[PDB]
Amino acid sequence: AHFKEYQVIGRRLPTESVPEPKLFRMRIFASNEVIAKSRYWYFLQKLHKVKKASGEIVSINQINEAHPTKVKNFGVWVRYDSRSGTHNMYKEIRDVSRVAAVETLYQDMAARHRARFRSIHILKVAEIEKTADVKRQYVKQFLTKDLKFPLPHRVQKSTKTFSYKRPSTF
Amino acid sequence: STDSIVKASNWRLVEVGRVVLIKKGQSAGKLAAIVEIIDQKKVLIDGPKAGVPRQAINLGQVVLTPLTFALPRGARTATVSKKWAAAAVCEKWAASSWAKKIAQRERRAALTDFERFQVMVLRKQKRYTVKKALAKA
Amino acid sequence: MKYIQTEQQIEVPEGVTVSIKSRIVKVVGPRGTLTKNLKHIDVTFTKVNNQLIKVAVHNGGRKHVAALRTVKSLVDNMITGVTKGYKYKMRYVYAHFPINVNIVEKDGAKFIEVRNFLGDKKIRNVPVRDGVTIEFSTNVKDEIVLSGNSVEDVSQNAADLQQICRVRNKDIRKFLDGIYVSHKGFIT
Amino acid sequence: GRENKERIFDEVREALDTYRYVWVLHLDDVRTPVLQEIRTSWAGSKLIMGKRKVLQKALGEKREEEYKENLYQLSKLCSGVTGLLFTDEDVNTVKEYFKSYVRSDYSRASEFKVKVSAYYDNDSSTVESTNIN
RNA sequence: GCAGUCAAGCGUUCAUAGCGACAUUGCUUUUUGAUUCUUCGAUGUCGGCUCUUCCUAUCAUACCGAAGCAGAAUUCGGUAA
RNA sequence: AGAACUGGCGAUGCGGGAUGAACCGAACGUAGAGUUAAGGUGCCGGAAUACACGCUCAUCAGACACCACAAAAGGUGUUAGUUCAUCUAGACAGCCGGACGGUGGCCAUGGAAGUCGGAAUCCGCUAAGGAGUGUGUAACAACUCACCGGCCGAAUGAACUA
Numbered sequence: 047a048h049f050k051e052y053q054v055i056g057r058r059l060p061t062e063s064v065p066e067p068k069l070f071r072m073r074i075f076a077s078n079e080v081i082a083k084s085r086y087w088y089f090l091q092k093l094h095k096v097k098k099a100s101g102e103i104v105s106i107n108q109i110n111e112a113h114p115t116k117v118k119n120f121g122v123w124v125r126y127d128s129r130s131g132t133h134n135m136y137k138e139i140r141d142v143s144r145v146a147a148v149e150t151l152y153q154d155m156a157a158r159h160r161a162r163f164r165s166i167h168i169l170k171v172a173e174i175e176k177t178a179d180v181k182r183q184y185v186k187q188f189l190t191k192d193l194k195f196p197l198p199h200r201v202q203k204s205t206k207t208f209s210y211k212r213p214s215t216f
Numbered sequence: 217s218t219d220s221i222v223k224a225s226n227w228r229l230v231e232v233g234r235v236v237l238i239k240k241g242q243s244a245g246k247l248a249a250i251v252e253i254i255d256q257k258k259v260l261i262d263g264p265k266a267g268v269p270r271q272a273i274n275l276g277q278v279v280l281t282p283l284t285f286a287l288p289r290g291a292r293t294a295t296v297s298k299k300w301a302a303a304a305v306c307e308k309w310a311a312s313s314w315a316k317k318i319a320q321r322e323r324r325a326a327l328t329d330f331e332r333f334q335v336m337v338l339r340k341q342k343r344y345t346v347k348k349a350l351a352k353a
Numbered sequence: 354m355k356y357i358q359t360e361q362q363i364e365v366p367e368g369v370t371v372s373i374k375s376r377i378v379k380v381v382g383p384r385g386t387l388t389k390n391l392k393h394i395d396v397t398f399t400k401v402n403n404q405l406i407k408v409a410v411h412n413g414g415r416k417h418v419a420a421l422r423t424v425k426s427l428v429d430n431m432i433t434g435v436t437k438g439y440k441y442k443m444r445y446v447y448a449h450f451p452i453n454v455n456i457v458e459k460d461g462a463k464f465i466e467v468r469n470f471l472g473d474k475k476i477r478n479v480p481v482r483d484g485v486t487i488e489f490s491t492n493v494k495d496e497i498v499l500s501g502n503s504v505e506d507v508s509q510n511a512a513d514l515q516q517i518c519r520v521r522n523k524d525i526r527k528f529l530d531g532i533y534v535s536h537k538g539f540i541t
Numbered sequence: 542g543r544e545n546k547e548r549i550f551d552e553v554r555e556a557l558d559t560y561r562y563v564w565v566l567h568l569d570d571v572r573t574p575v576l577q578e579i580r581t582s583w584a585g586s587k588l589i590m591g592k593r594k595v596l597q598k599a600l601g602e603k604r605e606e607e608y609k610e611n612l613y614q615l616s617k618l619c620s621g622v623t624g625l626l627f628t629d630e631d632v633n634t635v636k637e638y639f640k641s642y643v644r645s646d647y648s649r650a651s652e653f654k655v656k657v658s659a660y661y662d663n664d665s666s667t668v669e670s671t672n673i674n
Numbered sequence: 675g676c677a678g679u680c681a682a683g684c685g686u687u688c689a690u691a692g693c694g695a696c697a698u699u700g701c702u703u704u705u706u707g708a709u710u711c712u713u714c715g716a717u718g719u720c721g722g723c724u725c726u727u728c729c730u731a732u733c734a735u736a737c738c739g740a741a742g743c744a745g746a747a748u749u750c751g752g753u754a755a
Numbered sequence: 756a757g758a759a760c761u762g763g764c765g766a767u768g769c770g771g772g773a774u775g776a777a778c779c780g781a782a783c784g785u786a787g788a789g790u791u792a793a794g795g796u797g798c799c800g801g802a803a804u805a806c807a808c809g810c811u812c813a814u815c816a817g818a819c820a821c822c823a824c825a826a827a828a829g830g831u832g833u834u835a836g837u838u839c840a841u842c843u844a845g846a847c848a849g850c851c852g853g854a855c856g857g858u859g860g861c862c863a864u865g866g867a868a869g870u871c872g873g874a875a876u877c878c879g880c881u882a883a884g885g886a887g888u889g890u891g892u893a894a895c896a897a898c899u900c901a902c903c904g905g906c907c908g909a910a911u912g913a914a915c916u917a
Contacts, residue, residue, distance in 0.1 A: 115270050117252050117260055117290075128917060135836065140254060142272045150808065157809035158835050159917070187357050193253060195357055195411055196227040197275065198397075216227070220365070221372040222400040256355065256412065257808085274807075354834080415833075524743055545903090546844075549882070569905090573855035577880050590882045592904060598844050622852075622904060624882080649852090 047077035051145045054086040055104040058096050069104070075148045075168055079106060089167075111143040119177070119185060120147045123169035126161045138182040144171060228280040233287035235305055236261060236278045243268050245318070247281075247309060249296060252289050264297040265306065283308055356410075359418050361425040363406040369435055371406070373398050378428060382435035385484075385502050389431060396424055430504045438540035440500040441511045442490075445518075445532040454497060456487060470518055471530045477517050482506045497532070500540060508537075549591040553599035553625070554608045556587060560627035563661040564635060567621050570646055570653065576624075579642075579655075583628065590624040611661075614668040618659035632660070640673055 052074045058067040070090060076082035083106065087098045117140070124135040137154065141147040148168060155161040180186045200216045228234070234250045238261075248263035254272065261278070262270040270293055285303035287296065300306075309315050327335070365371060369382035376391040376398075395417070397409045410421045433439075445452050453468040463481035470477070481487060485506050490496035497514075501507040515532045557563065580588055591599075600616035601607040628635060639655050646653035660669040 115260070115272075117254060117272075130917075133837070133916075137836090142254070142258075142260070153808040154835090160810095184354050188253065188255060192231075193357075194229050194231045196229040197280070198227065198411060218370050220370065220400045220403060220406065221374075222398050222406060223374060224399075225397060256357070276807085523745085527744055543841085543844095545882075550844090569852065571853070573853065573881090573884075575855095576853090577855065580880060588881090590904085592844090592882070594844050595882090602844085620905095622882095 049075045049077060049145045049148050050082075051075050051109050051148075052079070052082040053107040053109055054082055055106075056086065056090060056096070056101055057104050058101050073109070075145060082106065111145070114143055117142060118144075118147075119174045119180060120144070120171060121174050122147065122151055122171050124151070124155070125167040125169055126155060126159070127165040128159070128161070136181075138174075138180060138185045140185050140188060147171065228282055230259065230275070230280065231284070232289040233285050233299075235281050235283050235285070237281050238268065238273075238278050241277050247305070248278075249285075249287065249300065251287075251291060251296065262293055262296055263300070264293050265300050281309075354415075356413055356418055358409060358411045359413065359421055360407050360409045361421060363408065363425060363428055363432075365404050365406065365432065366436060367404075369432060378431070380428070380431045380435055382432075384435050384438050387431045387434060387503055389427065391424070391427075394420055394424055396421060433539070434502045434504060436541075438500070438502060439504055439507050440498065440538055440540045441507055442535050442538065443497045443499065443511060443514065443532055444495055444535050445497065446529050448528065448530055450530070454489075456481070465514065467514075467518060471520070471528075479510070479514050479517055482510050485510050496535075546592065546595045549589060549595055550599045552589055553591075553596065556589070556625075556627050557609045557612075557663055560587065561629045561663045562627070562632065562635075563615060563663065564626040564628070564657060565615065565619050565623050565659050566626060566639070566655055566657050567619065568624055568655045569621055570649075571655065572644075572646075572653075575644055575653070583626070585630060586626050586628040588624060588626050593619070593623065596623065596625070609663055609666075611666040611668055615659050615661045618670060632662075636660075636671070636673065 053071060054074055055069060055071045057069055060067070072086055072089065074082040074085050076085055083103055086103070087096075087101065090096060090101075120139045120141060122137050122139060124137060125132060126135065137151065139147045139150060139154075141150055148171065151168075152163060152166065155166055174180060177189055180189065198216065202213060204213075230250060230253060232250060232252065236248050236250060238244065238246055238248060246263060246266040246268050248261040248266060248268050250259050251262050251270075252260045254260060257275055258272060259275060259278075260270075260272045262268065283305055285299060285305060287299050291299070369380060372379040372381070376394070376396070378389045378391060380387050395410075397411070399407045399409060401407060408421060408424050410417055413421070430439075445454070448471075450469055450472045452470055455466050455468075457464050457466050464478040465481060465487065467477040467479070482501075483506070484503060485499060485501035488498055488500070490498055499507050499511050499514075511534055515534070518531050520528055520530060580586075596619075597616050601613055602616060604613045607613060626635070636657060639657055642655065644653045645651065654674075656674055658670065658672065660671065661667075662669075
């Protein structure tokens with residue numbers, strides 16, 4: 047769905063002889079509140095020894111975008127499980143907000159590389175502040191000064207099954 | 217007669233300061249200006265004087281109008297509203313024959329049945345002058 | 354990768370004039386006129402100023418961009434074919450049987466007649482196309498010269514003329530009877 | 542490779558103090574046995590060749606930075622493929638030499654002759670320009 | 675049974691013009707098995723004669739490509755029923 | 756061919772898999788109305804020729820579990836990638852200007868000088884030029900690249916992954 051980036055905070059268990067377990071937080075892209083609590087215990091089990099029964103969730107917080115209307119260049123690091131052994135991947139996305147770029151990444155991996163939702167691990171999404179270090183090319187061609195291009199051959203969506211004009215393009 | 221007669225094939229082209237008209241969605245027939253291009257299909261539009269909020273949209277939902285003006289890329293909404301009024305694009309929109317056609321089919325929707333009857337009587341009186349003005353040449 | 358636009362440049366000298374409606378190309382100059390039909394290649398031509406003409410493809414794939422360079426190379430051969438003009442010179446290697454090559458005319462059809470090739474009684478006919486003039490080399494032995502405006506009219510007629518003399522059922526290392534292209538040069 | 546360019550960058554610099562005269566020669570059509578006897582007949586001279594944009598930068602293409610002074614004027618005088626020479630015995634001898642020097646070459650029976658354009662002296666710090674064919 | 679791929683020895687020199695051992699992956703039911711599925715109140719259960727059609731994994735004919743192809747005569751391969 | 760646990764079919768229709776004892780959904784008194792399951796919405800065929808991001812062009816495409824077949828190995832077809840390197844002190848490609856001396860080292864000798872053959876293997880001058888890649892002359896002569904430079908004006912090359 048439309049993803050929402052969340053902040054999930056976890057605290058193992060206040061037990062006798064160890065008060066105050068340390069704390070842990072993560073940034074989770076997910077569709078709703080119920081997934082991102084369960085997606086939190088997916089990663090955080092792999093990093094150290096807790097479980098869902100041995101742990102508890104402190105608080106979740108929805109992080110809205112700091113600047114929606116400003117247009118950003120985003121670099122994403124991706125670890126995905128292919129049919130062979132898994133491997134890294136770095137891709138660059140020119141999009142509007144943080145959580146909208148991950149929307150167009152899961153489409154991009156599914157289209158080109160056939161990776162589903164369950165195979166991909168979003169490593170880190172960072173904003174490239176200055177230009178001219180944009181490494182990929184397809185992001186870079188939109189960065190020239192005074193960019194102008196037409197849209198040739200536009201189609202027209204007709205509501206009637208018959209039209210009498212013998213229609214023409216643009 | 218010693219020139220290159222190559223045709224122009226002029227086109228409306230997306231750029232910063234290209235004013236657009238939104239056909240489908242929540243907006244539905246309000247002007248807006250392209251603030252900044254994103255990629256092949258998505259652009260960032262705004263019209264403050266029209267009332268459409270600033271948002272990022274796909275170019276399927278919009279159609280390009282041949283009017284332009286100068287606007288610096290990445291401009292904010294308060295910057296756009298001054299350039300919008302200074303070019304007077306809202307006055308320049310109503311000068312077109314395409315803005316008349318939209319208001320023409322709009323006015324035909326809101327006709328009272330008695331007002332629709334008056335169109336009948338006047339179109340009878342009009343054609344009687346035409347058929348005499350014709351067939352004398 | 355869906356290049357946003359690519360373009361090339363067509364240089365036009367002083368003596369020639371071009372005229373382009375939608376994708377029909379007419380090139381007029383000193384030696385003559387040539388035409389070409391480019392409805393299939395899907396491009397856009399644009400004059401800037403009287404000597405340079407930019408071709409353009411907006412939003413194209415790699416198969417579409419690769420055919421944008423060949424629009425340059427096909428119009429440029431129309432330019433040099435009218436200013437300079439194309440001229441091939443072919444020579445015919447014979448082992449024991451000399452070859453008698455002439456130009457004969459049957460109802461205005463201008464047939465090139467290859468006789469006595471490797472001692473064959475068969476008479477072959479290769480038609481001269483429109484806009485190609487064949488003359489035989491004065492005071493240089495064993496040479497046939499093809500000249501014309503267009504490359505595709507000249508070079509195909511040069512390629513037709515060699516494949517009619519191809520050797521069958523024999524070894525080619527011993528037997529070298531045939532007509533070949535020496536080099537591909539200009540008139541002026 | 543590139544490390545040859547960073548090498549020849551250095552021995553242009555350190556040649557300036559050891560030899561007082563700096564000679565640069567325009568030489569387009571030469572032979573390698575022609576070059577080696579220009580080398581072996583000048584044992585006092587140290588002859589180091591290289592690429593121009595290296596030899597411009599090793600002399601310094603800007604007027605701001607240089608190894609020794611009044612150095613940027615002599616580097617702009619060279620246009621073609623050049624090979625430097627460093628001797629100190631006389632100014633009269635070397636300009637006499639390559640005018641007297643002649644061999645034959647390709648037409649492309651035809652004589653070959655290398656010619657000089659710009660002279661310099663280190664301890665004097667003044668740049669000289671001439672045209673001998 | 676047939677086809678791929680790896681190439682050992684060979685073709686005086688040189689793996690790959692031409693032959694080919696075995697590794698390794700397959701296809702076929704024109705093979706023998708394996709099963710005993712349908713038929714045990716009968717499906718008339720060998721070969722030949724006569725006769726039509728189909729498959730191509732091509733012996734000949736057509737047109738080509740390769741060589742350790744001078745011609746002639748062959749060898750190897752391609753589209754091809 | 757023979758066992759374990761559970762659900763089924765036999766003993767059972769109904770919607771879906773075109774068709775099918777066993778799969779997915781759901782188990783039945785007679786009717787009206789509302790909403791759904793699995794499956795579907797070009798047309799047959801009830802239902803969006805919906806919306807959105809991409810990929811793919813087959814001179815045998817491909818189309819949805821059980822299920823009605825395909826493997827190893829290849830492909831500057833194409834789109835993404837990773838790891839290395841080279842460059843705006845000018846790359847890769849293209850042309851244009853150099854390409855050398857000791858020394859024909861030697862063993863072969865009917866005849867190879869870097870090169871029909873063969874054990875061997877360095878220095879000088881050197882921007883750079885290999886006791887040397889090939890075209891080939893009985894042998895020489897002669898030519899090229901790889902080693903460098905000048906014009907030349909933006910990225911490129913190599914090996915791999917899916």
